[PDB]
Design a protein around this ligand. Structure first.
Ligand SMILES: *[C@@H]1O[C@H](CO)[C@@H](O)[C@H](O)[C@H]1NC(C)=O
Ligand SMILES: *[C@@H]1O[C@H](CO)[C@@H](O)[C@H](O)[C@H]1NC(C)=O
Ligand SMILES: *[C@@H]1O[C@H](CO)[C@@H](O)[C@H](O)[C@H]1NC(C)=O
Ligand SMILES: *[C@H]1O[C@H](CO)[C@@H](O)[C@H](O)[C@H]1NC(C)=O
Ligand SMILES: *[C@H]1O[C@H](CO)[C@@H](O)[C@H](O)[C@H]1NC(C)=O
Ligand SMILES: *[C@H]1O[C@H](CO)[C@@H](O)[C@H](O)[C@H]1NC(C)=O
Ligand SMILES: [Ca+2]
Ligand SMILES: [Ca+2]
Length: 461
């Protein structure tokens, strides 16, 4: 069984990696990695929450964003802080400090109860160990087996966590009617497939939909899921029940297409301002010079047009006009590491003069295409619309077979048929993405892969 890919594992993508996953609403994507946004950037609408330092926060986002920025400050309770209320988890009846039967003291309830093992998974186990100090979550191979004793009472606490929470306080608890025997949730916290955090687990746990690692190493590099997990085209697995649950989990977005405090974070997403991108060829532009040689531009937003370098620098005059309506081009920025012969980094930004002398560059009625932030959005055998009429090309795999060392897989994309023009692709929700630009049967078109230039794009845009 060869579910896991090896070539990713060098780059070690955790849940903090944009390219493979969505940043939590108290975070912002910057250079492929989830960073903290300041509390005053969170959506205003939310109910108050309590942090372990007895401090109260208007929104749940704002708390989690302070915890993000300022370690130590954990979560405690929904609603304002009580004076007496204080949360506690503990491992009792155990031969060592990093193991036992889990005991929870629910901030409000003065009574102390145990957890039931019939619903106890790695999602809860990891979260438990994480607030217990052990930063690598629960052990997956090891156990703590009991032999009766303290199995008198009928008490129990069913728990459920997403799995990435930094405290059991954040999870949802519900008292259940316990059967037997035996039903008490044990755990072994990890004290020394490898995870990015440093945790070894067996290969059978890798790529099954379940976060065994704690930071999602075992799930982000998957050609196909093991058990019930659902394979995102992006190469990631998600729990089957993550299908049609009102949250776009896969960066590709396919789990929510074709459908007819965990609940609080989902709520916080649906209020974030979504990008207005890629609504015959509205994005299509044509960069004509006064000489008479044309390039196939693609409108991405506002003042900006994206094209290939070589065609622009074919002009002697260095003065253009953008046709689609006629705008003028103020300045042009080529990528600094453009290599003429190899065509690596064959990409350039055009900045329009705007004109009007009163407002902004944007055209009254023009739709910008979407710029891919991840190189895992579109994959082989995906269909894409080439233009320069328009031809439906397909993305081809293993392009070393055709060109070898003239094709640099990180910086270039090959589209097999079935200047500087666009290679536009659409996802399941009808979002038009500018996937590639035209760069240079057994000769498939080669395209500079734009997703690998989102940081670069961003720097100027
Ligand atoms: C929440 O949003 C509504 C509009 O949907 C708005 O009327 C209200 O003022 C917002 N809440 C706060 C606390 O500002
Ligand atoms: C959570 O907190 C709010 C106050 O912030 C409270 O009114 C509400 O009843 C609590 N419970 C739920 C399930 O929202
Ligand atoms: C894409 O556009 C079509 C237009 O026929 C529309 O019916 C459909 O709802 C859109 N796709 C999705 C996933 O909604
Ligand atoms: C211990 O107490 C429980 C609940 O009060 C009751 O079932 C019984 O008296 C004892 N349990 C067993 C298994 O003997
Ligand atoms: C890639 O797409 C083609 C479409 O014809 C189809 O064979 C299959 O979905 C994929 N190819 C393979 C070999 O799995
Ligand atoms: C990639 O090349 C290998 C040989 O090096 C070949 O087996 C395979 O068919 C190629 N893949 C594709 C999708 O053409
Ligand atoms: Ca797993
Ligand atoms: Ca989902």
């Amino acid at each position: 069984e060869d579910l896991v890919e090896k070539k990713c594992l060098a780059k070690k993508y955790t849940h903090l990696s944009c390219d493979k996953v969505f940043c939590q609403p108290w975070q912002r994507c910057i250079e492929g990695t989830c960073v903290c946004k300041l509390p005053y950037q969170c959506p205003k609408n939310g109910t108050a929450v309590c942090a372990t330092n007895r401090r109260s926060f208007p929104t749940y986002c704002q708390q989690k964003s302070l915890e993000c920025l300022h370690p130590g400050t954990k979560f405690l309770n929904n609603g304002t802080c009580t004076a007496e209320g204080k949360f506690s988890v503990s491992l009792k009846h155990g031969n060592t400090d990093s193991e036992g039967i889990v005991e929870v003291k629910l901030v409000d309830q003065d009574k102390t109860m145990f957890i039931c093992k019939s619903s106890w998974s790695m999602r809860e186990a990891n979260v438990a160990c994480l607030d217990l100090g052990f930063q690598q979550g629960a052990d997956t191979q090891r156990r703590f087996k009991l032999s009766d004793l303290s199995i008198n009472s009928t008490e129990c606490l069913h728990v459920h966590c997403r799995g990435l929470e930094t405290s059991l306080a954040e999870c949802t608890f519900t008292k259940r009617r316990t059967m037997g025997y035996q039903d008490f949730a044990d755990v072994v916290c990890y004290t020394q497939f490898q995870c990015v955090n440093g945790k070894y687990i067996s290969q059978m746990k890798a790529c099954d939909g379940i976060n065994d690692c704690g930071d999602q190493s075992d799930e982000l590099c998957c050609k196909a899921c093991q058990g019930k997990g659902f394979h995102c085209k992006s190469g990631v697995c998600i729990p089957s029940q993550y299908q049609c649950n009102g949250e776009v989990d896969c960066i590709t977005g396919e789990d929510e297409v074709g459908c007819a405090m965990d609940a609080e974070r989902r709520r916080i997403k649906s209020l974030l301002p979504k990008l207005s991108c890629g609504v015959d060829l509205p994005w299509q532009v044509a960069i004509k010079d006064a000489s008479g040689i044309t390039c196939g531009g693609i409108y991405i937003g506002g003042c900006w047009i994206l094209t290939a370098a070589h065609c622009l620098r074919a002009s002697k005059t260095h003065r253009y006009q953008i046709w689609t309506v006629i705008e003028y081009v103020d300045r042009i920025i080529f990528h600094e590491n453009y290599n003429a012969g190899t065509y690596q980094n064959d990409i350039a930004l055009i900045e329009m003069k705007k004109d009007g002398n009163k407002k902004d560059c944007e055209l009254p009625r023009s739709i910008p295409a979407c710029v891919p932030w991840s190189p895992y959005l579109f994959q082989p055998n995906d269909t894409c619309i080439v233009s320069g009429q328009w031809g439906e090309v397909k993305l081809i795999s293993n392009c070393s077979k055709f060109y070898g060392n003239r094709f640099y897989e990180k910086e270039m994309e090959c589209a097999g048929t079935y200047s500087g023009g666009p290679l536009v692709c659409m996802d399941a929700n009808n979002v038009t993405y500018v996937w590639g630009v035209v760069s240079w049967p057994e000769f498939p078109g080669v395209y500079t892969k734009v997703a690998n230039y989102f940081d670069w794009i961003s720097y100027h845009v």
